[PDB]
């Protein structure tokens, strides 16, 4: 019945070093209903043009 | 389960049949008197079906009779001259038929039969479109029937015979018809965006009592009257949702962002307000307190003519009927369910085959990090060049182009070959000449 | 059963192919029948209908070559023309990325025709910009002076001409004859003439009709139309007063509150747009716009669990997209729910109907991977984001960061140059290029890059220290 | 973290990596001794205890487990 | 007796996946990966006559069997654009004994997605034909005076004046005998008709024409009585012969572990609490869970 | 300070994590394994088709389209990314739909690419369809002695806005 002991002290930065930054995660914006309808009406014309 | 319409007794109702509004009715056509309603559905394919559902099962379908001509707008009201017992009205395109669903019992759950008797009929000169029913004027204990026509005319039957019939002034495409009892008025929505109310005795004497120019044409109009405090008239357009007063002006309105198909202002809760539920073409139900959404649910199908009724000791069950043939009683789902990955100790990740494939792909990756013959022949004579290309493996989407120089000009630039079987030769020939 | 009845019932149930299919028959059978005529007209015009309120794609010509705002340099805070770019990704010099793309989004405006042309076609609108913003019936054959007498025909005919054929001049002719037939007493014809004007270019001549229609009968439609007109004349504070007037008329309308919130977000004071989106929520609670906006704002202001709740709500309401599931993945990972994280990205990659959506999902998977460690997986994900969308500047920047982590300086320099060439409005590629240059030397390139960084994110900190050190080296 | 994640073999190999890669921190040795003694071995737990005592001193809670894994071994 | 088209089973045996006598395979597709269970393992999909089967194709033990009388929605999703070919995906929603599952099937190799079409087709054929393998009361069977036959059905014996020992006064009715099912209408208000399929019959004996149901339509004992018993025993023996010759090869009239827990459509929910009334909304609502409230579940 | 605040959602989530941490760990490791598998799969497929515009043998190419109207300016920004080593023999070949776009020179040599300079190599694409049709255009950069493209790029041509 022994519990493993954890260090109570973390790692602390002692100087700020210029590191190359990464771009940030990108939440894909949702669409409206008018926009979806417009895109689908734009692609349906293409489909009928190709299907003739 | 949250925001879903959890399932109750549900069924599919035929072989690619087709329904519309007015089809789904829900009342006591059996005249038991106990309160439990019974589903009634009639397609314009012909079959009239009546169910007494219990929470799939065989004995649920009371009857599935078939009439020859199509069926429009089954209704349940006091459509007989003598008694105060509910009778079932079936409106075929050129026919009216009042019936009576009498159920006799046997000494077993499935020994009980149901007989529909033709109480009376009515040959329809014009082609019927839809109808309404109510106690026209101030009569009580009677349910007269005002049927419309596809060409505008509205004909009124006083529950026995052809009372009269008057043409609607200025209508081309017949819209939804309803009858308000607190004002004794037939209210319709003409093709020209006008919600119009006519007093009954005015039409009986043949005009417009009042009009309101809503922005569109309405799909349905449902005058609801279980509240005697402040009367209102609901009008569901194809783009908006109005609740009008009794004088003729908008009490309030909602600018819906979806495409409604059906709505039903059912029993209310607060003082003065009226709960209502509308069905998208996006497979959803919305439950407003007259403007304000109180709940929303994902329906399985596109609801046509929803109803709310007490079915087998459960009050307020929502009965929906699609136009393809589905039908479903349902209750709201109010169970917020933890979003958490399922614990399936049985299902383990097969490390052997997956590691084989990953070793293959990683081998390709770490390895890469360290079919057709063309020939040209020029003639010895604007010299004509001929290019022959021959493949070993079968190839596809072949494009051959020639580039000489700016001054020299070719009589042919691009040549397109589609798929070619292996060991097949292709020759092209063009001519090059100086221009400049 | 019968032709006209079955066709009209197909129309009621929103079939819109069968209806026309029976009317075409019924019209070949009888050359004199106007019921089926206008029914087929309705079906045709409603297969393509889209409400004019949320169609605001000015494009490029309107943005520069058309001046309508009275004030040229109005006070900051009264014209349309939060989290810093160190947290929230950006699209222009400012204008952080929004939730709920709508086809009325302008999201900044270009300065010159050259800049608008030489940029990506979809960097100022939800759709690529445009310079200008048999047949059932031939418009040149019918005498609109005779259909105007019959309003039942005239209304559907105008809707056909306007929304199907897009003939604003003949539509306006018909609407003028109709309005003069009604003695200017029906608000609908006034609203339609106002719409004809508004998409002809005449805003004041449209505001006149919209005001005269509001005087007839208050409707949410006319309120939103005037809101569009006022926003076109660059007058936010007039549109807000008009919206509060409309809410005084309609006490709890959702579209009006949402328009107020849209105007407050265009003016970029989120502290009121959140309040108005919360009012929309108190009214609707399924509103995709308000839910998405409050969810994004909750995610980026280091509260990803509340954003995960707000997006699980949209998941509960049957919404099934690629955007929604990638958002759920980002939220689950950053809210520390590691069980439902990667399955959401898998559903996203499954649902993506594009090559840019797939690239964004792979970009976010690379972010997940680099948060897990194992920089090789993130390397592969960024390279796949590039392979899917070649003009993906964030993938270039992150892949260059990982390359310089490995050691390959020239690869990182080239990739950061490509990123800063694709998206100049971003600050990370410029800052990283300046940093690596200064690390090796080349203080001229370091200055030319750090100054563009300061031009992109002007309140940065490391950019200021870099510029100070550089200007100190120059003396 | 692996000891509490129903994965003791991975904890074994991780502790081996650590003790090979650690030189002047006895906490690793004491924790590996605790893992071993809890695994019912009590044999290599003495080896890790002796490795720790060869490495060695201030932490209040690494002192007690030092003496408790000593006396109970 | 017959469960292939009535249940949804997981980790099925190598024998129960085999085509039942009346069953018949239609289409197959290899490399169809299974999802909604993130095992990332391939398989093989089969669209049989009565059910859809999927076996792992590498560890064929783990598998899925979904009956057609237990599916609600089947949706095909064409996505995953130009980066590779247009690959499809199958979403099946199932509800067996009030438990909702959802399975997803991803076609890995984009070179053969046609399967996902035929399934839809046969599913319609499964639902448009239920008078072949199910028991129904009071349906719309009779024409003007004759029976409306199914596609693969012809009458054998045409008997008039056959009583029904389940009612009191509406008995005397015709008795139609066919190769797929046996029906009796009432000859007087001819909507009291019963259409029993041979599939649901368990044993036809006499106690009088007693017909028992096969534990699916319940213990529905049907009793009929005819004229002098010569034709009666004749009908009983011919009915038994037809029953056996049908059960030899069924028809079905279709023209042309913790595994469950990882496939729930709801998410960690296999349940539906007792639907009780709701004074707040006025609708029949599912019971609330020990402290929750409606206006607290609605807000965010 | 601006230290953030935590609501009931956070404590409920931490309680779920404290009571069901093992299942989360296991399922996240399984998901990570499957993600590595699928990422390696897609990387190998891209290497096969050679669809990466960034791929010893150092190069980097991306194609920008400019202009509305029937005539678009398509400029390929190509760059040698190496310490000091030029690339002598390379050539660019375009793949388009010959019924929608009229490329004058669909194949041309590239100059000697000096390490560090972005070479803009531009062409004039022209839409031929009278109806608006947007079709992809592929670009392959490849050696002159080899037949497998060194790298590739894609461009979705916008709508024509013709006359």
Residue numbers in the entry:
A (entry chain H): 7 to 58
B (entry chain I): 2 to 56, 63 to 213, 234 to 397, 410 to 420, 439 to 493
C (entry chain F): 1 to 81, 90 to 141, 158 to 499
D (entry chain E): 347 to 402, 408 to 424
E (entry chain G): 6 to 212, 219 to 267, 296 to 339
F (entry chain D): 425 to 479, 483 to 590
What is the paper's account of this structure, in its own sentences?
Patched 1, GPR161, SMO and other ciliary membrane proteins are all ferried out of cilia in a regulated manner by an evolutionarily conserved complex of eight Bardet-Biedl Syndrome (BBS) proteins, the BBSome. Our recent cryo-electron microscopy (cryo-EM) structure of the BBSome revealed that the BBSome exists mostly in an auto-inhibited, closed conformation in solution and undergoes a conformational change as it is recruited to membranes by ARL6GTP. Given that ARL6GTP triggers polymerization of a membrane-apposed BBSome/ARL6 coat and enables BBSome-mediated TZ crossing, the ARL6GTP-bound BBSome conformation represents the active form of the complex. Here we determine high-resolution structures of the BBSome alone and bound to ARL6GTP, and we map the BBSome–SMO interaction to model how the membrane-associated BBSome–ARL6GTP complex recognizes its cargoes.
Mixing recombinant ARL6GTP together with the purified BBSome allowed for complex formation in solution. The BBSome–ARL6GTP complex was analyzed by cryo-EM, yielding a density map at an overall resolution of 4.0 Å. Focused refinement of the top and lower lobes of the complex resulted in improved maps of 3.8 Å and 4.2 Å resolution, which facilitated model building. In the BBSome–ARL6 structure, ARL6GTP is nestled in a wedge opening between BBS1βprop and BBS7βprop. A ~ 20° rotation of BBS1βprop from the BBSome alone conformation allows ARL6GTP to move away from the steric clash with BBS2βprop. This movement of BBS1βprop is accompanied by a twisting of the first two TPR repeats from the BBS4 α-solenoid, in line with the close association between the N terminus of BBS4 and BBS1βprop seen in the BBSome alone structure and confirmed by cross-link mass spectrometry. Besides the movements of BBS1βprop and BBS4TPR1-2, ARL6GTP binding caused only subtle changes in the structure of the BBSome. As previously found in the crystal structure of the BBS1βprop–ARL6GTP complex, the BBS1βprop makes contacts with the Switch 2 region and with helix α3 of ARL6GTP while the Switch 1 region of ARL6 is readily available for interacting with other, yet unidentified, complexes. Interestingly, the ‘backside’ of ARL6GTP (i.e., the surface on the opposite side of the Switch regions) interacts with a loop that connects BBS7βprop and BBS7cc. In addition, the physical interaction between ARL6GTP and the upper lobe removes the upper lobe flexibility previously observed in the BBSome alone preparation, resulting in a more stable BBSome conformation.
